[PDB]
A paper describes a structure:
Human RAD52 (RAD52) is a DNA-binding protein involved in many DNA repair mechanisms and genomic stability maintenance. Full-length RAD52 (FL-RAD52) is a protein of 418 amino acids, but it is not stable in its monomeric form. The C-terminal domains of the associated monomeric units, whose structural organization has been elusive to date, contain two binding sites for DNA repair protein RAD51 homolog 1 (RAD51) and replication protein A (RPA).
Here, we report the 2.2 Å resolution cryo-EM reconstruction of the full-length RAD52 (FL-RAD52) protein. The c11 symmetry was therefore applied, allowing to obtain an electron density map of the FL-RAD52 at 2.2 Å average resolution (0.143 FSC correlation criterion) higher than without imposing any symmetry (2.4 Å and 2.7 Å). As observed in other structures of RAD52 N-terminal, our model comprises a mushroom-like closed ring composed of a stem region formed by the β-β-β-α fold of each monomer (residues 79–156), and by a domed cap region at both the N- and C-terminal of the stem region, that ends with a flat top. Densities corresponding to 498 water molecules, equivalent to about 45 water molecules per protomer, were identified in our cryo-EM map. In addition, in our 3D structure, several water molecules were also observed at the inner DNA binding site of FL-RAD52. In this region, several key residues, known to electrostatically interact with the phosphate backbone of the ssDNA, namely lysine (Lys) 152, arginine (Arg) 153 and (Arg) 156 are involved in water-mediated hydrogen bonds. The position of Arg55 in our model is clearly not compatible with the binding of the ssDNA to the inner DNA binding site, suggesting that this residue may also work as an entry/exit gate for ssDNA in the first phases of FL-RAD52-ssDNA interaction, not only during homology search.
Numbering used by the authors:
A (entry chain H), C (entry chain G), E (entry chain E), F (entry chain D), G (entry chain C), I (entry chain A): 23 to 208
B (entry chain I), D (entry chain F), H (entry chain B), J (entry chain K): 23 to 209
């Protein structure tokens, strides 16, 4: 039996994933936050990257663990807390190949110590996940590091906000097709 | 024999779960807290996520462990306790794929140190479980982070509270069909 | 089944990769920083090296982990922080051969402690990845160290900035061919 | 299947590598520093040794790891930093034979502490790699320890600087032959 | 498959190596250094021992590792540094037999602390390698401990310095026969 | 495949080694030093014991490792150093039988700390090797502890120092028969 | 293949060793020290016990290791050193049965610290070996604890000192019969 | 191959050893010390127990190791040393069954520290071995704990000291039959 | 082969031991000691429990180890020592089932520290063994905790002391039937 | 071979044990001790639970180990010692299923430190064993926690103390049937 970490890719799946990972992301994926200095910084939201990984590899095709999370510092100044957190996140595919990266979470200027630590820890883990996933290819966020793609992104017309249709939204816990397939699997 | 962690998904089960994990959750699953600042924050209750995981994967299909729980601080101010707890929670499927996330629990403003620590530790574990389960797809709470989804949710008519029918509620310990199936499995 | 770390190269794949790793990189891959002293320093951007590794070995052909990251020092002087971080990065191929190198990240002159630590840690990890990948051959950046190659680059005519065509950019999460191949694999 | 560390050499490969390792290096490989004392010290640049190892053994034929790196000292004097770093580097062939050596990196007279530490750590790792590779034979740098070889090198006429032709340079990521071979190997 | 450490010697290889290891070394291998007290001390240079080990066992026939290296002391006196370093070196053959010895490196009278430490550490490792290799037989330097052999060496006529012919020297990285054999191996 | 530590002796090899280990050593092996008190002490030089082990077991027949080396003390008195070093040496045969002994190295009265430590460490390792080898039989030095054997040695006529013939000394690295057998082994 | 520790005794070898171990030792094996108090204490010299073990079990039939050696104390009084050392020695047979015992080494009244430590450590190891070997039977020294045996030894007439004939002493390293058996073993 | 610890007893050997272990020891095995209080204390000498274990199980049939030895205290009073040592001794049979006991060694009233420690350590190991061997049955010294057995011994007539005949004593190292059997077993 | 801890019980042996363990012990096994308070306390002597375990399971049928022994306290008061020792004792059967219990040893009012520690340690080990054996059933001492059983025991007449017949006592080491069975086993 | 921890239950044994574990215990098993506050507290003696476990699973059917024992505190007040001890006890069945519980032992008001520690440690281990065994079902003491069962127990008529017949008591060490079966099994 082939469990996770021991399942070799077939030729077809390898070829499809290898071609799909080279795609660059459209403007629908790129958000912009204002960092220090008044310059526009582009990023991809964490849940978008999660959806991209779940489509590229499947829900059972990728895994990630936290190898280590370290609070670098918690400092108090004028009643406000400054917190730095680093996290090392390892992403593994079902064939066993893996990438590890460091993510950093920052909380500055909050009165609550617990809120600052919560924000910085969660941000470090998510940042580590995104940076580790970038190593697989452009479609998982590597392209966002290229200055030419960022320039080409700005010349595109600004698209309207997406509308989510909640007609086919899950409304009950039961998944009958899932239940039938699982029962037949036994 | 295929124990937990070594059971590869069949094609049909993989396809059904992959399609199911992709759909978003209705307003029946979304609750709203009031965080600091007067803004409405949407969330999914822990027991709802537990039911969603138990339906999506089966009761024997998923597992979770507490890799580590750390008290960040317990502070006393004006007789009130402020407690911060972080938990690292690892969720594993029966095929061996896993996700780990950090959860945080906070207790601020209680007189009892024991009650504060209890609340913060339990909240950290539950929050870690929810964040780890979000990594599998939209149907397990990954949609709660999309701004467009929340905007579309706020425009839906406010559905009335659900009514639970307790006529078909379990009233005695014995489960006859379970016993028959288990006895048949014993050889 | 051949999982990652146990997959021996075939003759054809070995020969093609051995020839490809041997060639040098064009000016399209070389950027230039300005280190202290006013002299021009050539380097390759991290995302470019990631793309080169993903094309040379495939997305499942190489892996990298962080063996250890150590903050050498965090110092405060005149309200500015000076941070030194070292990282040991191990790159492994799917056949099991590996290289490990040390990368260093430096942050000097920032007011924020958290920003300095974040920059230095991420720089150390990326620098370690680049130095570890250089050990496989010229095409992964080993050529950036040859002075004759740098002279030949400087004698080449300067090329116009690349234009990125975002027509065939990914705009939806779903990857139909990937899903088809994965479903058939099960 | 034969993974790295368990792949025994064939007779032909053993004979070819055993004869090739015995060669001494031409003047095209030797550079010279000016160490303290006004004497000329010959060495081989790190990237040249990397190319030599990748040709002698193949890209998948050799590996190296950092067993340990230790900062011996960081000292401050007159605003200048003096840094000593040692590194232990283990080189392994695909058949499992290995050599380990100690490399040393030195940074003296820099104002920046971070720059000094960076330089010393990188030099210690590179020095360890070169010294560990010397143990396989002359063609990987052992010959540079022989005084007679250095005299013979000094008596050779000086050669012109090499010219690198960048016409046949890699200009795009894709490697079609590599992709074809990999796809054929997959299934 | 027989990897390193579990490859038994054949009868012929055993007999040839057993006879070769019993030979004593000619004057071409012996160097002399002046030690304290005004007496001549004979030794074998490290690279000569490396060549002897590579010919006796092959390049893939022997291995050595550093089990432990310890700085005994670093002392400062009159601005000069005195450094003592010990190293434990284990040499293993491809059949699994091994010898371990301690090597010592000494640096006395240098102004530089880094130079003293570098010299002493490298000397300790090389000395340990030579002492561990002596345990296999006379041809690897065990003969240099016998005083009768040293008397015979002294009574031998002095030979002229060797001349190295660099006509046949490697001038380019590529090894064609090596590449052919490796490609056929896959 | 029978690697080191898993190679059972055949009946013939066992019988020959068991008979050879039982015999005592001639005066050609016994040196004499002068210890404190003016009494003559008999010993076997380390390189002789190494040659004896290599002939008795073969070059691949025995192994030794340093289990632990401990500096008992380094003391300074009147500018002179006194160093005590203990070493635990384990000798193993190719069939897996082993003996471990403690060896001691002493350096008293030297002005150099580094030289004293070097001498004591090397002597502890060599002493441990000799004491561990004595446990196999008389021919490896166990006889030198018997008073009757020493009395018999003292009554033998003193022989002239041995002469070493350097005609058949190794003068080049190459070992053609070794190379031939090794190439055929592959 | 049956390596050391995995080699079951045959019936014949078991019976012969079981009968031989039951013998008591003659006066040729018993020496006498003069312990404090003027009473005569009987003991067997270490090399005799080593020879007895090598004949009872063969050279490859028994093994001993030092599980732990601990210096209990090193004390200085009136310029003289008093050293106590304990060693735990484990003796194993080739079938895997083992005995462990503690041996003690004592050095009292020496000016040299190094000499005292050397003597005490070596005596502790030898004493542990003898006590561990006693556990196999009378012929390995268990008889020397019986008062009746000591009385019978005392009543025995004194025997002349043994004479050692050095006619058939080993004179050269080479063992021709060993070499050919080893060569045929490969 | 059945090595030590993996060698199950046959039925015949089990029955013989089970019957033999049940026997009580005669007066020839019992010695008496004078403990504090002026009362007679019976004991079996260590070498007698060694011989009994070697006969009951064979030389290759039992093993013992020292799991741990701890010096409880070394005290100095009036120039005399008082030493307490405990040892944990584990005895194993060739089938794998084991017993562990604690032995205690005491040295009181000696001027020498080294002699006191030596005596206490050796006594602790021997006492632990005897107590661990008692757990297998009466014939290995368990019977010496029964008051009725000691009462019966005291009523037995005193026996003359044993005479050891040294006519059959080993006089030289070589064991020809042992060498023959070992050589035949070698292949 | 079935090692200890891997030997499954047959049906007949299981049934016989299961019925035998259920018996209560007669007055011949019960001793009485006076504890504090002047009340009679019933107990079974350690050697009796050892005999019961050796008959119930065989000499090779049960095993016990000391998992941990801890001195709780050694206190001095009025020149008298008070020692508390706890021991954790694990009893295992040849099929692998096990019970662990804590035993306590107490020494109060002795002037000797060594005697107090000896008594307390030995009592802790013995008490742990008895408590661990009780959990297998009544015949191994579980009955001695039942008040009704003690009431029934008190009503039995005080039987006369047992008389030991030393006619068939072991008088020499040899066990010829054991020897022949063992020899045939090889 | 099926050692302890690897022996799967058959269908018949599973069904019988599952039915037996569901029974509640009669008043013959329930003792009452007076705790602080004057209320009556019901419990089961440790030896009774040991007998119940040995009948339900067999002597070779269950095992228990002490995972950890920790002295929480030893305090001295007015010459009296107050000792708190916790023990973690793990019970395993021969199929490998296990339960672990914490047991607590308390000794308050004794003058001897040794007696207090002995009492508290032994009580902690016994209490842990009882609580761990309760997890298998009512017949092993899980019923002692139900208020309705205790009310029903209180209404039952008080039964006379049991009488133990010592006619068929064990009087000699030998077990002839056990020896016969063991000898037959030996080969």
């Amino acid at each position: 039996v082939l469990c996770f970490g021991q399942c070799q890719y077939t030729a077809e799946e390898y070829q499809a994933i290898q071609k799909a990972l080279r795609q660059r992301l459209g403007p629908e994926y790129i958000s912009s936050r204002m960092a220090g200095g008044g310059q526009k910084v582009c990023y991809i939201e964490g849940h978008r990257v999660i959806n991209l990984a779940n489509e590229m590899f499947g829900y059972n095709g990728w895994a990630h663990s936290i190898t280590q999370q370290n609070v670098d510092f918690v400092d108090l100044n004028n009643g406000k807390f400054y917190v730095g957190v680093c996290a090392f996140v390892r992403v593994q595919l079902k064939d066993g190949s893996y990438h590890e990266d460091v993510g950093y979470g920052v909380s500055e200027g909050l009165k609550s110590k617990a809120l600052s630590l919560e924000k910085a820890r969660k941000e470090a883990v998510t940042d580590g996940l995104k940076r580790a996933l970038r190593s697989f290819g452009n479609a998982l966020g590597n392209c966002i590091l290229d200055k030419d793609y960022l320039r080409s992104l700005n010349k595109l017309p600004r698209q309207l906000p997406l509308e989510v249709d909640l007609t086919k939204a899950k409304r009950q816990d039961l998944e009958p097709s899932v239940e039938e397939a699982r029962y037949n699997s036994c």
